[PDB]
């Protein structure tokens, strides 16, 4: 998962002062899609030739995209853009609509 499918860095070539990442990974065709992952070729320790689905179920799902926290409490920020009006009038008009609806 981290190397065959994902392209996790494995080392770094040293080149004078500079450094560049080295990685291991299957060609993209093998990791194109869920169905592709279900057929991800695996060479077992005992040299058995299996696919990823033989040892795991792969399921698409939804969840956290990014966890914003403020003072250790989850929070979502709504970005409002009003530039014709003055701020205070808009905020007070928002405070009304929000409180009522």
């Amino acid at each position: 998962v981290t190397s065959a499918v994902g392209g996790a860095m494995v080392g770094e070539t040293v080149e004078g002062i500079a450094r560049y990442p080295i990685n291991l990974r299957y060609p993209q065709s093998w990791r194109d899609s869920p169905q592709a992952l279900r057929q991800l070729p695996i060479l077992t320790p005992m040299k058995q030739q299996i696919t990823l689905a033989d040892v795991a179920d792969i399921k698409v799902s939804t969840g956290p995209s990014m966890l914003k926290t403020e003072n250790a409490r989850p929070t979502s920020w709504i970005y409002i853009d009003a530039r014709d009006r003055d701020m205070v009038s808009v905020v007070h008009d928002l405070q009304k609509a929000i409180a009522e609806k």
Binding site: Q39, Q48, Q49, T51
Partner: protein
């Protein structure tokens, strides 16, 4: 159309198998410049050996030829020679030269590669010793390994294509293919055996070969993959309306590939 690639091995054609053994005991007179790993052709001399088993009956045949024996008495004796092992070609030499045959040459019965050569100069030879194991590679074999869980991928109508990393300049034609009855317990894979034309002998046993299979499914609605949104609990596509209006529609996904 499901596409998928499988690793395959180039191996010897096992229907072109020959294991030479002497029809009778004797001793080696000479062994030809040969050894395991060498390619031999049909008729290639393997070794020369002396066999004393057939000399008594041979001479018995020759004397009848003298004392005007009957053709029945003659044939009857040639029959004893034949089912005593003596090769037909050698028996033919007996009748043509009227001389007793003691020294014989064993030749390669078929074109192929020597995979065993257990006899060398100076030895005696026994009925169970293998003078030469010869395996052919013209209609070369290519066995592909398919993981057991993907058995469904291979059907009768499946279209196959073969390539060998060693020969990128080579387009290989598949003579025929078979899905073997059992799976290799060691690797947990199904064995798919292909027979390939190899007249130019570009495909050497032990080589790597990549097998690409194309298989057609039952007819299903077909769309591109970037056109499908999947949130885990629902799949949908965005339909375009006669007006150009973009309207979402739920769909059920069957399978996908390529």
């Amino acid at each position: 159309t499901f596409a998928q690639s499988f690793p395959a091995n180039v191996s010897y054609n096992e229907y072109q198998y020959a294991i030479v053994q002497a029809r009778a005991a004797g001793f080696i007179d000479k062994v030809y410049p040969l050894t395991v790993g060498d390619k031999v052709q049909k008729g290639t001399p393997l070794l020369d050996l002396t066999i004393p088993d057939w000399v008594e009956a041979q001479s018995e045949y020759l004397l009848l030829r003298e004392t005007g024996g009957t053709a029945t008495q003659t044939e009857g004796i040639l029959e004893r020679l034949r089912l005593a092992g003596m090769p037909e070609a050698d028996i033919r030499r007996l009748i043509a030269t009227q001389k007793i045959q003691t020294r014989f040459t064993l030749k390669a019965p078929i074109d192929g590669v020597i995979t065993a050569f257990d006899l060398r100069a100076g030895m005696n030879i026994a009925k169970d010793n293998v003078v030469a194991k010869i395996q052919g590679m013209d209609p070369v074999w290519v066995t592909a390994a398919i993981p057991e869980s993907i058995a469904w991928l291979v059907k009768d109508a499946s279209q196959f294509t073969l390539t060998v990393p060693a020969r990128p300049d080579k387009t290989l034609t598949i003579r025929k293919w078979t899905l073997l009855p059992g799976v290799d317990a060691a690797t947990r894979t199904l064995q798919l055996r292909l027979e390939v034309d190899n007249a130019d002998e570009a495909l050497k046993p032990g080589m790597n070969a990549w097998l690409q299979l194309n298989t057609a499914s039952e007819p299903m609605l077909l769309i591109p993959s970037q056109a499908l949104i999947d949130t885990g609990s629902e799949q949908r596509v965005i339909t375009v309306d006669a007006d150009g209006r973009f309207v979402p529609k739920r769909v059920a996904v069957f399978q996908a590939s390529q």
